[PDB]
Design a protein around this ligand. Structure first.
Ligand SMILES: O[C@@H]1[C@@H](O)[C@H](O[C@@H]2CO[C@@H](O)[C@H](O)[C@H]2O)OC[C@H]1O
Ligand SMILES: O[C@@H]1[C@@H](O)[C@H](O[C@@H]2CO[C@@H](O)[C@H](O)[C@H]2O)OC[C@H]1O
Ligand SMILES: CO[C@H]1[C@H](O)[C@@H](O)[C@H](O)O[C@@H]1C(=O)O
Ligand SMILES: CO[C@H]1[C@H](O)[C@@H](O)[C@H](O)O[C@@H]1C(=O)O
Lengths: 671, 671
């Protein structure tokens, strides 16, 4: 019913086989069993071999050995340097052929088996392996925005694979868990952060048996299960008159709820919480702050080892567009930075990559680096809400690396975002990264076949943010489409270029938005320009942009450390790609590229469509080297992309010609 | 549970009573029974009397006599001049006191009883009555946009009173039928013109018993029942492979469906049809035209006397905004005028008042007067979709009179729209007017208490388009709020001024729209400006407006007869209130009022809010003269109106300052 994605395990030719007779499985835990089963599956599919699974080595057999450090006869120095529980070593014996996959814990053996299979899919020579791998981020999580009626909020890839008709739908969940574990993902929240009436009951006896069955499957693949919760649950399901976190009976209700969940799911991860945001209830309803609110839940989960993931996407969703001094981009920092040092140690603040809302380009959220005493994790959006909704191609890995590599200068040079969220800069006990899932029930999982690369690459970056976009794309393409060099170079080029192409024909120079309200797909320059969501570009007949300077604007630049604040504050040094996020400028202002702002708009919108046409041409040149079904699936979306790009180009160019009166330098067609 | 609206029948003081001992009911048909019951109800409530109902006069009793012409002992010349079946005479005997209510048919007696009760509510002296009344429009209809899940499309007054949970909900239906008959309405379609899956079954045995029960109630009040139909019903419910009107089995399926309905509802009115509009299926799907499509249904209903009401709201709902030669306003005329003479005699084309879509101001649809061989009826929208959604006050009767009194010049001077749709200009056998219902389950029926005046006034104009807005408002206010002269002058002033006030702060000079997409409430100047619905204003930094001239534009003016075409074609003679519907003009163009177009925009938006504030002030001055519940219901909406008017003012003024760069002449506050 559905694609294997990158775990194709395509049969090798006769010149690319391996000789093994046994798999030595030193443990029989559910994770070890999963790891053995995956190894058997990949070796049968790729190599046409069926080695016997044994618990003790045969010293004359060719073997793959699976074990932790304490299972080793001799513990050699490389695996001796492992410190992270999920780390592993893979090494070929240099003496029969033996591969040792040595994990610090059972999950390290599982990740090591997926790495060894990845090497095989990629055609690597395994005769002399010596590999050590340890993840950089402790939490590597997926958030689902699935509802129990089967819809998915901002889902562009079909219906929920978890829920239908206000109930739970499992073989597809197992295959999903395999995909997640193959790229190291170790945590999942299964339900929408906007928790509606049925979903509120996921923390009650009526649904916990079902939650536990799903948690059982994920546990076997090293994945902890979380639920998103309704902060007002003590009222809605617990029959209490209030949800105030300082009310003693509320506090007790949450403690009892925690105890009940852990009876069904003894390793339950904890709660994801959207509170006091977009009309979802929270501590503010009772005049409480978010440390009081998060700490109350944290205290309920603490005896059991659970975490509270408290989202920082908090802002005034009833902003007056007339009020130019109120800045939504400042809201998260202003709410949370004063609370540093007030949170319990099992609270993690989860902060989106940018301060507004997953736009095609945003600067980095100032909260990263600003709270040395509070755990932080970053949230990115794998589902392409503002980045083309899986109709347009948009490989998000280059954007995420720009965010991860941004130096906050919080402790001087070398204070990159990735060091904040991996916990090393400030010694966070719990931290990491989360991604909003792009999957659904479509047979290709992600709507656009090539959007499988975004789920893959999310997991790779969460494991090691220092991996290049180039090598992630290479890994993904080879595993998914094979090793023909034209196919690999072409699809890698398509992926690596796609975000810039989509940006070119959507909103200019960092200002964001210019999307249709509601569904958020397609061009509408004034879509939210007189609305109450704080998302304005202030275009008039003379110029455009948000003045976020301290000197004359909202003062948002001051939320950065001095080196970045100065860069953005000055009109002359602010990078072109963010100019209109930080400055209000005339259409005739000249950018670092030499272009005026208005001619930049025309250039990128005309040229963006030409680039989209080239994406499609380059894919067509692969006909015959890709199976027809995926060839045509992708070609259909690239054609949709080209036609919609023309709409983006002409709507934006006409809007700005109608406002600026300045023609295209080159005389190209503006309606 | 709900208000009596204008049928209050408030108790009279002791100096305003009537003496009657008997009601002579010469017939005992269900309509006569309804008429007697209403008379008994009004006389008991107003006069505290309970006359006995008898079938033969007592020559010494004071009496009200009810009968048709053939029941008269002596037929005097006035009732002798009646020709319309629903006409009646009311006259006091000039000899005991006797009032004769003499109808041409039983429905004329019912309308005559409601008129006599109206005179009593209004305090008129009935000692020497001599009244004759005959309706001008043969069809005086209400269209419901109710769905069977209980929602109402564009309903601002609560949920359906007919349906809930995909079934039928009747005492409220009886009281609704009384309100409709009191203002002469004689036809109703009970379900949305967009016929969804459950509603398609209203023409099948599963729901016809329920339809018949509702039809039974309306019949007693002289009202014929219609259903809206899904043109693709032969596929969806009849298991046929096509819905092509020329397919013989389709034709037969509709004939059998007609025969089945008439077995349950022997006087069934017929079908309302939305076809080939906004993605609803129709004859075009099979390459057929609308005469072929309407005539097929007409032939099915003809043996039974049914009518096909075929809506002309047909246009390209996939228009390219770049294409300035395609004009949605021309679509209905271009589709239907070439079909004149091709329709069966029981088809009526139902045409909205304007060629676009119920905007606050539109010019009159050119189809009126253009089809001398095809029955026409006009559709107006009582529910205030673009006229404030019953949050803002908007008494629509002045607008409807402008449309009704518009001279088309089709047969020279004196070819008013009202003469087209009353059938007199062209001798139409079936014609009239229909209004989209503004009611729902709210206890005050219409959402805004004062919107009851729009339902009342619709029925009054449908009976006699020559009634003044002033006298309709006077009738409505006295019956609903009493005869205190301050209350009557104030609420009449509020009503009569309200449409112009709402127009003043919404879209300028006839161009329409500037509303939020989707729900259509509140300001959004570019809301649909780059959309596919054909609703563009073309505002740029120099000017605004649609060029609909023959000389340089879309040529829409040529759809009018020469006198009107010339008026609109010339920039100098086009009325200011429609200028931007017909011309694209610079912001500095001077109107007949002396204002530039841009300063006109500022003036009416600032002053419109001041006028809304005055509506509220004048209502507040009535405290103590209105019951507190309706006082506060209305005051709450007027406060909502004032605050929303400020939003309309500032959004439009800021948009046009940002585009034009021209400041307000008077220095008032533009953000
Ligand atoms: O971040 C904000 C989004 O959460 C918001 O989402 C909208 C909420 O109201 C709904 O009815 C809309 O359909 C949904 O799109 O959009 C604006 C953005 O600022
Ligand atoms: O006349 C047109 C309306 O019928 C149209 O209605 C919209 C149809 O699509 C829906 O999803 C929207 O919610 C609804 O408002 O609006 C545009 C107008 O030109
Ligand atoms: C779950 O709500 C989402 C919302 O649909 C989406 O439009 C916005 O981008 O992000 C919100 C969030 O991050 O909470
Ligand atoms: C029933 O559809 C309606 C639609 O909701 C409304 O937005 C438009 O004004 O008029 C359509 C019509 O008249 O058919």
């Amino acid at each position: 019913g559905y694609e294997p994605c990158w775990l194709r395990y395509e049969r090798k030719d006769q010149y690319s086989r391996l000789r093994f007779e046994e798999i030595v499985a030193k443990r029989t835990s559910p994770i070890f069993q999963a790891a053995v089963e995956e190894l058997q599956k990949g070796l049968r599919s790729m190599m046409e071999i069926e080695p016997q699974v044994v618990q003790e080595v045969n010293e004359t057999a060719n073997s793959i050995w699976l074990g932790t450090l304490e299972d080793e006869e001799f513990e050699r120095p490389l695996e001796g340097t492992l410190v992270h529980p999920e780390g592993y070593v893979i090494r070929s014996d240099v003496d029969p052929f033996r591969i040792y996959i040595i994990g610090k814990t059972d999950a390290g053996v599982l990740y090591g088996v997926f790495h060894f299979l990845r090497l095989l899919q990629m055609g690597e020579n395994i005769a002399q392996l010596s590999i050590i791998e340890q993840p950089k981020n402790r939490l590597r999580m997926i958030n689902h925005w699935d509802n129990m009626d089967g819809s998915i909020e901002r889902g562009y890839a079909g219906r929920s694979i978890f829920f239908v008709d206000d109930q739970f739908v499992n073989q597809r969940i197992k295959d999903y868990a395999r995909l997640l574990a193959s790229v190291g993902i170790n945590a999942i929240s299964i339900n929408n952060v906007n928790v509606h009436k049925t979903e509120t009951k996921l923390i009650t006896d009526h649904f916990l048996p079902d939650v536990a069955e799903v948690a059982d499957i994920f546990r076997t693949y090293g994945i902890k299960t979380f639920l998103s919760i309704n902060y007002a649950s003590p009222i809605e399901i617990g029959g209490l008159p209030t949800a105030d976190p300082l009310d003693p009976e509320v506090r007790w209700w949450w403690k009892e709820t925690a105890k009940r969940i852990y009876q069904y799911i003894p390793d339950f991860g904890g709660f994801v919480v959207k509170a006091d945001s977009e009309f979802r209830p929270g501590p503010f309803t009772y005049g409480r702050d978010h440390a009081e609110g998060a700490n109350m839940l944290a205290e309920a989960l603490a005896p059991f080892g659970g975490l509270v993931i408290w989202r920082c996407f908090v802002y005034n969703c009833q902003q007056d567009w007339r009020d130019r001094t109120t800045d939504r981009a400042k809201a998260a920092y202003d709410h949370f930075k004063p609370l540093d040092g007030q949170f319990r140690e099992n609270v993690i603040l989860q902060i989106k990559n940018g301060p507004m809302d997953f736009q095609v380009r945003e600067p980095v959220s100032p909260l990263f680096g600003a709270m040395p005493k509070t755990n932080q994790m970053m949230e990115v959006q794998i589902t392409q809400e503002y980045t083309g909704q899986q109709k347009h191609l948009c490989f998000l890995i280059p954007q995420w690396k720009e965010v991860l590599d941004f130096d906050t200068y919080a402790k001087g040079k070398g204070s990159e975002v990735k060091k904040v969220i991996d916990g090393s800069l400030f010694d966070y006990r719990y931290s990491g990264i989360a991604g909003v899932s792009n999957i659904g029930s479509d047979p290709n999982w992600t709507g656009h076949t090539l959007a499988q690369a975004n789920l893959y690459g999310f997991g790779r970056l969460a494991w090691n943010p220092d991996l290049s976009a180039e090598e992630i794309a290479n890994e993904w393409v080879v595993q998914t489409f094979g090793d023909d060099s034209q196919v690999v170079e072409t699809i890698s080029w398509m992926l690596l270029s796609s975000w810039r192409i989509y940006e070119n024909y959507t909103s200019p120079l960092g200002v964001g938005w210019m999307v249709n309200p509601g569904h958020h797909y397609g061009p509408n320059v004034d879509g939210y320009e007189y609305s109450h969501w704080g998302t304005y570009h202030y275009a008039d007949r003379d110029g455009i942009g948000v003045d976020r300077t301290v000197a004359t604007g909202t003062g948002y630049t001051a939320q950065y450390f001095p080196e970045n604040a100065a860069m953005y504050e000055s009109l002359d040094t602010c990078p072109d790609e963010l100019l209109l996020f930080f400055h209000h400028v005339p259409y005739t202002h000249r950018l670092h590229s030499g272009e005026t702002v208005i001619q930049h708009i025309y250039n990128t919108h005309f040229e963006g469509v030409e680039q989209a046409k080239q994406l499609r041409k380059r894919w067509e040149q692969l006909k015959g080297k890709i199976d027809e079904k995926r060839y045509h699936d992708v070609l259909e979306r690239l054609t949709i992309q080209v036609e919609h790009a023309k709409e983006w180009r002409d709507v934006i160019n006409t809007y700005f010609y109608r406002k600026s009166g300045i023609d295209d330098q080159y005389g190209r067609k503006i309606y």
